[PDB]
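Quick entry between incubations.
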Amino acid sequence: GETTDGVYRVMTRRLLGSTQVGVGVMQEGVFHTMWHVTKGAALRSGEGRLDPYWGDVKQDLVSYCGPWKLDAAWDGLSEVQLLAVPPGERAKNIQTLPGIFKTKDGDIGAVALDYPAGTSGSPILDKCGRVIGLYGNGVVIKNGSYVSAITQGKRE
Amino acid sequence: DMYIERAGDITWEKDAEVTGNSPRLDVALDESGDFSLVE
Ligand SMILES: CC(C)(CO)NC(=O)c1cccc(Cl)c1
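Done. Structure below.
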């Protein structure tokens, strides 16, 4: 199938027409998305088949064809870009300064941008274009606004 | 059956639209991977 590095849409034909359920990152021959997007199911890429390799519901991440490859981290100071891939709309970079999710196990960056749920899996980038995490697992605040964790996996 | 379609290159864009705030939130992460607000 298609194995070029880049950001990809995750689609289904189970519902009405073709529906975008999420987004993912192809890097080093491995497809990276959020667990809630595919529920661990196999994917199709033209004539090719992508099988799940690693996943964890609590981290809300899954890799296909190989182990998780993304290891860049937010520096805790600088602005970043959400490379948003919204349903039926063109890929768009949005620059923002992340906030923080404070948890009993440590702090994590958080991006406060409003996009439909089908945008889950869009990559968050540092100034050198390295993927520091995926957008799409977070919380809804008072006004109905959305704040996503910067969710990053471990490169073994 | 789910399928993938290429949507673009992963690059930082100079002079991208700059927006969004930076809240400091107290949150909890459950066994199901769901975040919730703690107060
Ligand atoms: C609150 C809105 C509708 C804001 O546009 N977004 C979401 O509810 C949502 C849920 C899960 C993942 C992602 Cl990316 C967005």
